[PDB]
Amino acid sequence: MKYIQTEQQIEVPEGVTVSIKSRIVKVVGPRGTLTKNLKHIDVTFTKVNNQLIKVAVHNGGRKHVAALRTVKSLVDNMITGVTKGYKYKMRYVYAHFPINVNIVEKDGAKFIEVRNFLGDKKIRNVPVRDGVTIEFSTNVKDEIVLSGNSVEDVSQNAADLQQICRVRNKDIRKFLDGIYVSHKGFITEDL
Amino acid sequence: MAHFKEYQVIGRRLPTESVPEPKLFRMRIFASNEVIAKSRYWYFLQKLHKVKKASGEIVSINQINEAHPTKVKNFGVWVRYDSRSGTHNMYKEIRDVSRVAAVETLYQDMAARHRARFRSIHILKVAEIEKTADVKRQYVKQFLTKDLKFPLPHRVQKSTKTFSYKRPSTFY
Amino acid sequence: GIREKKAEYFAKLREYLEEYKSLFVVGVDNVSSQQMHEVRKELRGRAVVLMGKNTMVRRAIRGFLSDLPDFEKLLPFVKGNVGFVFTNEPLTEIKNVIVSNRVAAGLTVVQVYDNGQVFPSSILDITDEELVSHFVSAVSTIA
Amino acid sequence: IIEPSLKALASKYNCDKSVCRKCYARLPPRATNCRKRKCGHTNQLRPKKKLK
Amino acid sequence: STDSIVKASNWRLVEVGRVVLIKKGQSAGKLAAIVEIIDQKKVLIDGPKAGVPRQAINLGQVVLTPLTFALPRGARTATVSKKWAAAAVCEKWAASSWAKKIAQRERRAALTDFERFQVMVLRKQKRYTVKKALAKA
RNA sequence: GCAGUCAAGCGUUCAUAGCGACAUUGCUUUUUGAUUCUUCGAUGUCGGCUCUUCCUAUCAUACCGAAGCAGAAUUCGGUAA
RNA sequence: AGAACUGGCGAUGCGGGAUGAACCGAACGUAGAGUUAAGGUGCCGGAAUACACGCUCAUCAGACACCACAAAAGGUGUUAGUUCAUCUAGACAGCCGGACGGUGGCCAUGGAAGUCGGAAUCCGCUAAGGAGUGUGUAACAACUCACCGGCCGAAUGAACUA
Ligand SMILES: [Mg+2]
Ligand SMILES: [Mg+2]
Ligand SMILES: [Mg+2]
Ligand SMILES: [Mg+2]
Ligand SMILES: [Mg+2]
Ligand SMILES: [Mg+2]
Ligand SMILES: [Mg+2]
Ligand SMILES: [Mg+2]
Ligand SMILES: [Mg+2]
Ligand SMILES: [Mg+2]
Ligand SMILES: [Mg+2]
Ligand SMILES: [Mg+2]
Ligand SMILES: [Mg+2]
Ligand SMILES: [Mg+2]
Ligand SMILES: [Mg+2]
Ligand SMILES: [Mg+2]
Ligand SMILES: [Mg+2]
Ligand SMILES: [Mg+2]
Ligand SMILES: [Mg+2]
Ligand SMILES: [Mg+2]
Ligand SMILES: [Mg+2]
Ligand SMILES: [Mg+2]
Ligand SMILES: [Mg+2]
Ligand SMILES: [Mg+2]
Ligand SMILES: [Mg+2]
Ligand SMILES: [Mg+2]
Ligand SMILES: [Mg+2]
Ligand SMILES: [Mg+2]
Ligand SMILES: [Mg+2]
Ligand SMILES: [Mg+2]
Ligand SMILES: [Mg+2]
Ligand SMILES: [Mg+2]
Ligand SMILES: [Mg+2]
Ligand SMILES: [Zn+2]
């Protein structure tokens, strides 16, 4: 019906600065800095204090108002990600052919290489994305762990790796093999 | 049916020796001129009482000017209308300065949304919602808050000449 | 049904405001379900405790401003999580049954009602010494 | 072979889905509508069938 | 930096006592006050001092000035005049590059031929003394 | 000729994996009819041969989603001429 | 294919429907000036990229009588609306506290105390707390939820209409 004012809040935790101009956002906290282009949305920011900023949509129709909240979340995950930061854990599921997962590199690349997937003489390679770092758990078997400031980039990499192991021409209810995401929390604040 | 005027129409049955002085009947009628008003008075009368104009006469026709035509009001509007497949009753509210103002957006609003031309719409009752918070339709409650203020983002000044020696700004 | 059980409460709230002369507003922030059960036993003799939802009480009280009207100044006290202890036993004994016993790691008074007046439960916890040296320093002022 | 909790983990991706009865889209298990626009977002869903 | 930086667009708001410049019609070019808000596209304005009649007006044929004075919502014509006066709104209007240019524009359009001639001359006169300045440093 | 909607039944169990009765909405113009507008100062017809291009309601091939998909095989569907 | 009344085409140009016998407008000597009809006014194209309130976003939009087609059936797209129910005696959502006594209830048996399971579903104290919604234990524990409340302050749910 066109809601004349509708707005949302973004708490700025102690230790971060978020600066915003022509809807180009930059979040700077402990873990470093992220930026994001929010040009594609008409919303207007306003700072009340160094701990609070508001996002508002004036005279917006429904789907306009929808975009509001998502702006808050996106910016939020910038903040937390640069304070707490994100970390995705996965697991190797395979019922007979052990999945061999190692890091390689050509041209200072860093890829995720996946060998022996269900017996495949092929080798799979998933680019390791910038500012997402790859580790391997020491007690937890067949684990893999992906961490960094940016969910988007950390999530997606985890998803690129799951998606490269997708099982073709078999009944995927029987043949469950793959690298699936098992946990998603922060780097800090316990596990 | 356009720029609206509101009319009182007072009419009656033609007198019979048996019934000299028949009862007088009144309607408030919204039409643009008085001919359509009078014509509307019959349309409705014919549906309520057993009467056509060939057997009745119209006694009076007087315009009802808005009492306080610069006070902003919240209006209750009850309506009966014909869709393509049914006929329906319908309440909606309109914030404006006069009844005559309100009815016109009512008549447009019915076309915009339910595609209802003037012909297919009966105006049941219209009324100034006295106590705010008797307003129920949000899209008017929205304007009732204390110190209501809002901007008008993305100004678009129309141009007088077709070429412009500067890239326009939309800044209000 | 869901109105009956309210006017029911309304009834049995009113009944106490008439029968008992004195009233305890007791805060029960936190405080387990088991605690209150044993404040019932411990007080079963005289007092009765009566717990309720605030908006039901502010309203019922105001709805009783015809008769028993100086229950009106009771209302700036029925905020937060509070409740009612009614009694005809003397002040301190009950308040001390209330404050002290069944305390662990105990529900506490927040304001008291007495014949149209209001104690802070501070003026209740008296010292009698202040009541001794005020009749003494006035006989010393006289002398 | 393959421990219960991973068989489980794998099924979250492979078998706890619902399916559009019209276009066969693999849909989230609690879906109320299909997301594909070709079946006009129908609510005619069914659960992805479980193995033996 | 180490502050959070957020420039927020600082629009002229439509708010009781927002004072507006009328764009089209019999009350064109005149100032009025916004007295009450009808809806997202329509307000109530009154322009007592300048002779513009308390009316419902479509927001489109008005342009918000940056001025604002104190006014109770929906105030009859009279107290607008009282309030507007009190606040010295005309006085603040006149002082603006906006209000001044309009004056210039009308002045220019009022010139006789003979007056246009005279401008030309004096402008020549000023020119000469400028060009030299534009060459001594 | 081709495709739907409803869902009683088939389907060990289970309407809808794959089907689908009573009914019902449609589409097509390579069927056959109905029509008789055009051409009777006329110029054959069928089939094949040869060759090009177009349609898609897809048989194969590419990538997929389903299954009463363990594997193999198949089957239903999507993007696709 | 075939009748009724009338108006047409045929016999008839003109303006509009791009086009076109039959629609709409209007019927015609040779011309000037004005005004209009039906139809139009972004550009082709004469004429406001006029004013006003809504509506709509289509990886197959839609765009004007005759007319150059679309239907049943569907859509948590989005708009307005209806009925029923909840709610200022404070709901809904969200955060927060309590989640107790008979009592490890009866069977059963290595053990099963609310949560393998058969069988019942009672009471007390309550503002409220199931002879238990799940997690969990060898069995207890511990945690959860229903249920009541603290805060908040005006809306909420369900079915439909076009
Ligand atoms: Mg990315
Ligand atoms: Mg398959
Ligand atoms: Mg196979
Ligand atoms: Mg510029
Ligand atoms: Mg998942
Ligand atoms: Mg600005
Ligand atoms: Mg059967
Ligand atoms: Mg089945
Ligand atoms: Mg013939
Ligand atoms: Mg023939
Ligand atoms: Mg010939
Ligand atoms: Mg196709
Ligand atoms: Mg089966
Ligand atoms: Mg087989
Ligand atoms: Mg085989
Ligand atoms: Mg086979
Ligand atoms: Mg089929
Ligand atoms: Mg081809
Ligand atoms: Mg003719
Ligand atoms: Mg002839
Ligand atoms: Mg003719
Ligand atoms: Mg045409
Ligand atoms: Mg052209
Ligand atoms: Mg032109
Ligand atoms: Mg334009
Ligand atoms: Mg029609
Ligand atoms: Mg709809
Ligand atoms: Mg909690
Ligand atoms: Mg809780
Ligand atoms: Mg157990
Ligand atoms: Mg327990
Ligand atoms: Mg209400
Ligand atoms: Mg309806
Ligand atoms: Zn679908």
What does the model show?
- This is part of a larger assembly, with chains A (191 residues), B (172 residues), C (143 residues), D (52 residues) and E (137 residues).
- With 191 residues, chain A is of the alpha+beta class.
- Chain A has two helices and 13 strands, in the order ββββββαββββββαβ.
- Chain A has two domains: 1-85, Ribosomal protein L6 (Outer Surface Protein A, domain 3); 86-191, Alpha-Beta Complex (Outer Surface Protein A, domain 3), CATH 3.90.930.
- Chain A has a four-stranded antiparallel β-sheet with strand order 11-12-7-13. Chain A has a three-stranded antiparallel β-sheet with strand order 1-6-5, with helices on one face.
- In chain A, β9 and β10 form a beta hairpin.
- With 143 residues, chain C is an alpha+beta fold.
- Chain C has helices spanning 4-19, 33-43, 54-62, 91-99, 139-142, and strands at 22-27, 48-51, 82-87, 108-114, 118-119.
- Chain C has a five-stranded antiparallel β-sheet, sandwiched between helices.
- Chain C is globular.
- Chain D has a three-stranded antiparallel β-sheet, with no helix packed on it.
- At the B-E interface, β7 of B face β1, β3 and β5 of E.
- Bound molecules: magnesium ion (MG) (33 copies) and zinc ion.
- The site of one magnesium ion has 3 residues of chain E, from loops.
- The structure holds two RNA strands.
- Chain C: Residues 121-143 are annotated as: Interaction with P1A-P2B.
- Chain C: It is found in: Cytoplasm.
- Chain C: It comes from Saccharomyces cerevisiae (strain ATCC 204508 / S288c).
- Chain C: There is a cross-link at residues 12, 95 (Glycyl lysine isopeptide (Lys-Gly) (interchain with G-Cter in ubiquitin)).
Number of domains of chain A: 2
Please tell me how large the radius of gyration of chain A is: 20 Å
SSE-based structural type of chain A:
alpha+beta
**Percentage of β-strand residues of chain E:** 25-35%
Main location (chain E): cytoplasm
Organism (chain E): Saccharomyces cerevisiae (strain ATCC 204508 / S288c) (Baker's yeast)
InterPro entries (chain E): KOW, Rib_uL2_dom2, Ribosomal_eL14, Ribosomal_eL14_dom, Translation_prot_SH3-like_sf
Family (chain E): Belongs to the eukaryotic ribosomal protein eL14 family.
Give a summary of the structure in a few sentences.
This is part of a larger assembly, with chains A (191 residues), B (172 residues), C (143 residues), D (52 residues) and E (137 residues). Chain D has 52 residues and is α+β, with helices and mostly antiparallel strands.
Question: Could you list some keywords that capture this structure?
Answer:
part of a larger assembly; 5 chains; B: 172 residues; alpha+beta; Ubiquitin-like (UB roll); 2 domains; three-stranded antiparallel sheet; 7 strands; 20% helix; E: 137 residues; five-stranded antiparallel sheet; 6 strands; binds magnesium ion; binds zinc ion; isopeptide bond (chain B)
Topology at a glance:
This is part of a larger assembly, with chains A (191 residues), B (172 residues), C (143 residues), D (52 residues) and E (137 residues).
Chain A: E1 3-11, E2 17-21, E3 24-29, E4 32-37, E5 44-49, E6 52-60, H1 62-83, E7 86-93, E8 100-104, E9 111-115, E10 123-127, E11 132-135, E12 145-148, H2 151-163, E13 178-186
Antiparallel strand pairs in A: 1-6, 2-3, 3-4, 5-6, 7-12, 7-13, 8-9, 9-10, 11-12
Chain C: H1 4-19, E1 22-27, H2 33-43, E2 48-51, H3 54-62, E3 82-87, H4 91-99, E4 108-114, E5 118-119, H5 139-142
Antiparallel strand pairs in C: 1-3, 1-4, 2-3, 4-5
Chain E: E1 13-14, E2 18-22, E3 31-39, E4 42-47, E5 52-58, E6 62-68, H1 77-87, H2 89-94, H3 97-108, H4 113-133
Antiparallel strand pairs in E: 2-3, 2-6, 3-4, 4-5
Chain C binds two RNA strands through residues 2-3, 6-7, 9-10, 28-38, 40-41, 50-56, 59-60, 63, 79-83.
Family (chain C): Belongs to the universal ribosomal protein uL10 family.
Modified residues (Phosphoserine) (chain C): 66
Subcellular location (chain C): Cytoplasm
